[PDB]
Amino acid sequence: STNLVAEPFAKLEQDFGGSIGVYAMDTGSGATVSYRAEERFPLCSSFKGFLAAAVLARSQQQAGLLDTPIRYGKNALVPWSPISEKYLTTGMTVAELSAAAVQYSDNAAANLLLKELGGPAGLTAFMRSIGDTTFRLDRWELELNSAIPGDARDTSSPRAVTESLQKLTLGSALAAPQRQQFVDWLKGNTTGNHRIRAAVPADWAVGDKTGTCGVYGTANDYAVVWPTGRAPIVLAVYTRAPNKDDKHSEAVIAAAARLALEGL
Ligand SMILES: *[B@@]1([O])O[C](C(=[C])C([O])=O)C2=[C][C]=[C][C]=C21
């Protein structure tokens, strides 16, 4: 992955103060945009998108998985678990927990689903099973958010994120119904209006998954975007920064996404 007109990204990164990672592919032409696309960045909550895909893939071998209710306890409710909290008294099905993890970044949902898959190691093995040799999840919520510089736990690269997102939403990794379901959850995300969506023309359909670690200026977003009349674009925008107290920026993520889309 290289880029002979990277100066715009380099200037945005200098203005940001941290590091920016971008990979975008036009699945119609094959054109791509890269900037630190091979470098490792904390996933933060963005792993929750791939977790839901892994659940859908398991439902292809276990009938009734998605409809299975889970009557979880109050002490499943880790900070920022808005759907899980609201539905504590009733429980939630696996599909609802997947939906909640994708579209609200529900943390309790995320840990409950990880447990059904064998933990972080099971999600990682799923990702290996589709050809992602970069992704690694090592820890549960909320510990995976530590985002320590140079720590490779719970990281991937923007290119591997994009390539995996492509396989699961547009390729054959998932069966057709499972695939539409995964795209539908992403299209209903509520957390990403100031990130990639803020760079996408209002008349383009978008699904996305955000992540925010809360430390070290570390946040991200990845998305599938359908330009009018065309095959879709897939992209991933990740940030990090060298000081614990460096603030992340949603505007930086949106700007970097806009540079990628303009370059395509
Ligand atoms: B996680 O990374 O994602 C959300 C979040 C702020 C987002 O969607 O950008 C979140 C909240 C609380 C803990 C972890 C996460």
Numbering used by the authors: 25 to 57, 59 to 252, 254 to 290
Give the exact sentences the study uses for this entry.
A major mechanism of carbapenem resistance involves production of carbapenemases, i.e. evolved β-lactamases that inactivate carbapenem antibiotics, which can be divided into two categories: serine-carbapenemases (e.g. Ambler class A KPC-2 and class D OXA-48 types) and metallo-carbapenemases (e.g. NDM and VIM types). With the aim of helping enable agents to overcome carbapenem resistance in Gram-negative pathogens, we analysed carbapenem-substrate derived complexes and identified benzoxaboroles with a C3 acrylic acid group as potential inhibitors. Crystallographic analyses validate the proposed mechanism of binding to carbapenemases, i.e. in a manner relating to their antibiotic substrates.
To investigate the structural basis of inhibition by the chiral benzoxaboroles, we obtained KPC-2:(S)-4a and OXA-48:(R)-4a complex structures by co-crystallisation (ESI†). The KPC-2: (S)-4a structure reveals a covalent bond between boron and Ser70, with hydrogen bonds between the inhibitor and β3 Thr237, α8 Ser130, β3 Thr235, and β3 Thr237 (ESI†). Crystallographic analyses revealed that active site of (S)-4a to KPC-2 and of (R)-4a to OXA-48 involves reaction with the nucleophilic serine. The results show both enantiomers of some of the chiral benzoxaborole derivatives manifest moderate, or potent, inhibition of the carbapenemase KPC-2, demonstrating their potential for inhibition of clinically relevant SBLs. In all cases, the (S)-configured compounds (4a, 4c, 4f, 4j, 4q) were more potent than the corresponding (R)-enantiomers, illustrating how chirality can confer selectivity in boron based SBL inhibitors. The KPC-2 stereoselectivity for the benzoxaborole derivatives is interesting since the penicillin substrates of some of the β-lactamases have a (2S) C-3 carbon adjacent to their C-2 carboxylate. The difference in results for the (R)- and (S)-benzoxaboroles may reflect different distances between their carboxylate and electrophilic boron; the analogous carboxylate to β-lactam distance is proposed to be important with respect to antibacterial activity. Addition of 4a, 4c or 4q at 100 μM substantially reduced the MEM MICs, i.e. by 16-128 fold for the KPC-2 producing E. coli strains; notably, the presence of 10 μM (R)-4a and (S)-4a decreased the MEM MICs to below 2 μg ml−1 for E. coli BAA-2340 and E. coli 11119. Based on these structures and computational results, it is proposed that the C-6 4-methoxyphenoxyl group of (S)-4q, which occupies a hydrophobic subpocket adjacent to OXA-48 active site, forms an additional hydrogen bond with Asn170 of KPC-2 (ESI†). This putative interaction may explain why 4q is more potent than 4a and suggests that further optimization of substituents particularly at C-6 should improve the potency of the series for carbapenemase inhibition.
